[PDB]
Amino acid sequence: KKISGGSVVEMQGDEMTRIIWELIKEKLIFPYVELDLHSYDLGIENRDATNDQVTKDAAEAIKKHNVGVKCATITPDEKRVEEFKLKQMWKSPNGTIRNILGGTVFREAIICKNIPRLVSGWVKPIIIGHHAATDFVVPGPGKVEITYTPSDGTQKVTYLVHNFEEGGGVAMGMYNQDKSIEDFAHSSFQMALSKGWPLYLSTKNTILKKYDGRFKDIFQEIYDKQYKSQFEAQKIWYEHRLIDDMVAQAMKSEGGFIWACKNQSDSVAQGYGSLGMMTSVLVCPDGKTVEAEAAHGTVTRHYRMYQKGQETSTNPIASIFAWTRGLAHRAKLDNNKELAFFANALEEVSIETIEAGFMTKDLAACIKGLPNVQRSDYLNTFEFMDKLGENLKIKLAQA
């Protein structure tokens, strides 16, 4: 008989990840967990048919139920508008969800001992969260100034940005509200306590002494009053770092830390060919609400090959870890030891399978190099899923 998993918000997506998403639910989730499943179809056609209302409804559902797991979605461009005859170029579902939920996105790579790392000393995962303007054209010579006028009008400060003396150019003003900085701190501290890992904040406060110093000051202030004892209880710590020193410290580290960045990771994973092993999680500052997803997109290029009949080796691990992280967080909110056990076991099974030599083409290329990858070096998407299912069944049986 199956585990009671509780309230989970699920969002269905597009193209290749949609296929893998259902495979995950059929093969890996539903045979072992029963869910009070709040399910929303963020497929592109249904977003068009509902005028993006389903996107907003999914976000309020995550807000209500604290656990969202999301499949990758097409963000419409002009060519997508014609492909599906869209009513309009709908806004990114991801931007809509985070706008409604707030919080900070943290990315984490999944490490297998048989898989090379970009920096080989990184033997434990590193978790990175980023904090997330008015620009214009200067037609010609003249002063660009930026002014602050307090609501009392008691004073007024006019800062010189630049006096253009030879021709024109460009200029911009940008800002941050304290509250958004504070939320960034709380999410970062909540992430470190949840993971049991130390936390570092990197800034350029040597250069942006006021702008970035505010990030350092608000992080330290919130830490001292609200998290320092909770950190000491888990024997973790928080420290600010100049970005220069953080880069060097990280490259000489073995991993296992949170890195809050004040200035993204998925582009480096894509260059390295490890996007299928990179998970993503949006952490709201309340410490209660989480939205988990893969860091990659719908993998359109693999989906076209699948549509034309050709065989596909798309990596499902990041999509799988979206479910494990969501369910693990659901278990923590509910004190569900059986669900917590299942979520961890599925992560172990995923890593053990790869470390036993059964992997998708991307992983094999990471070991050998793609110009040396023969077809027997890897499994296709569906073989790999079957293999994970066999190994998951065994792991759960052997207990």
Ligand X SMILES: NC(=O)C1=CN([C@@H]2O[C@H](COP(=O)(O)OP(=O)(O)OC[C@H]3O[C@@H](n4cnc5c(N)ncnc54)[C@H](OP(=O)(O)O)[C@@H]3O)[C@@H](O)[C@H]2O)C=CC1
Which chain residues interact with ligand C81 by CB under 6 A? 107-109, 111, 117-119, 122, 125-126, 128, 243, 247, 250-251, 255, 261, 263-265, 267-269, 271-272, 274
398 binds, among a second copy, ligand C81, ligand X, none (CB under 5 to 8 A by kind): none
Tell me if 125 contacts ligand X by CB under 6 A. no
Quick one: which segment of 129-137, 149-157, 233-241, 268-276 binds ligand X (CB under 6 A)?
A: 268-276
Tell me if 296 contacts ligand X by CB under 6 A. yes
162 binds, among a second copy, ligand X, ligand C81, none (CB under 5 to 8 A by kind): a second copy
Going from the C-alpha of 245 to that of each of 206, 236, 255, 294, the distances in angstroms are 12, 20, 15, 30
What whole-number distance in Å separates Cα of residue 277 and Cα of residue 31? Answer: 24
Which of 79-86's residues contact partners 24+ apart within 8 Å by CB, and which partners?
Answer: 80/44, 84/44, 84/45, 84/48, 86/44, 86/48
Q: Which is nearer to a second copy, 49 or 247 (CB)?
A: 247
- Residues 6+ positions from 335 with CB-CB distance below 8 Å: none
| 128's tokens | 């990175």
Q: Which is nearer to ligand X, 203 or 298 (CB)?
A: 298
For residue 76, the 8-state DSSP code is: P
What whole-number distance in Å separates Cα of residue 131 and Cα of residue 76? Answer: 24
* CB atoms closer than 10 angstroms to residue 395: 16
Q: How far is the CB of 69 from a second copy (least distance, A)?
A: 25
- Residues 6+ positions from 362 with CB-CB distance below 8 Å: 273, 274, 275, 276, 313, 315
107 binds, among ligand C81, a second copy, ligand X, none (CB under 5 to 8 A by kind): ligand C81
The candidate with the shortest Cα–Cα distance to 72, out of 321, 319, 362, is 319
The candidate with the shortest Cα–Cα distance to 13, out of 80, 69, 65, is 69
Q: How far is the CB of 84 from ligand X (least distance, A)?
A: 11
Burial status of residue 289 (CB atoms within 10 A of its CB: 0-12, 13-18, 19 or more): buried
Q: How far is the CB of 240 from ligand C81 (least distance, A)?
A: 14
Quick one: which segment of 132-140, 206-214, 314-322, 387-395 binds ligand X (CB under 6 A)?
A: 314-322
109 binds, among ligand X, ligand C81, a second copy, none (CB under 5 to 8 A by kind): ligand C81
What whole-number distance in Å separates Cα of residue 291 and Cα of residue 39? Answer: 14
122 binds, among a second copy, ligand X, ligand C81, none (CB under 5 to 8 A by kind): ligand C81
Tell me if 75 contacts ligand X by CB under 6 A. yes
Q: Which is nearer to a second copy, 166 or 308 (CB)?
A: 166
Near ligand X in 317-336, by CB under 6 A: 318
Tell me if 301 contacts ligand X by CB under 6 A. yes
Q: Which amino acid is at 19?
A: I
Length of the chain: 399
What whole-number distance in Å separates Cα of residue 105 and Cα of residue 281? Answer: 6
Quick one: which segment of 69-77, 96-104, 282-290, 348-356 binds ligand X (CB under 6 A)?
A: 69-77
Q: How far is the CB of 1 from ligand X (least distance, A)?
A: 33
Q: How far is the CB of 260 from ligand C81 (least distance, A)?
A: 10
What is the helix (H) or strand (E) element at residue 8, kind and residue range? strand 3-12
Q: Which is nearer to ligand X, 16 or 260 (CB)?
A: 16
336 binds, among ligand X, ligand C81, a second copy, none (CB under 5 to 8 A by kind): none
The candidate with the shortest Cα–Cα distance to 234, out of 205, 198, 261, 287, is 198
Q: Which amino acid is at 130?
A: H
Q: Which is nearer to a second copy, 180 or 230 (CB)?
A: 180
Binding site for ligand X (CB under 6 A): 72-75, 94, 270, 275-276, 293, 296-301, 314-315, 318, 362
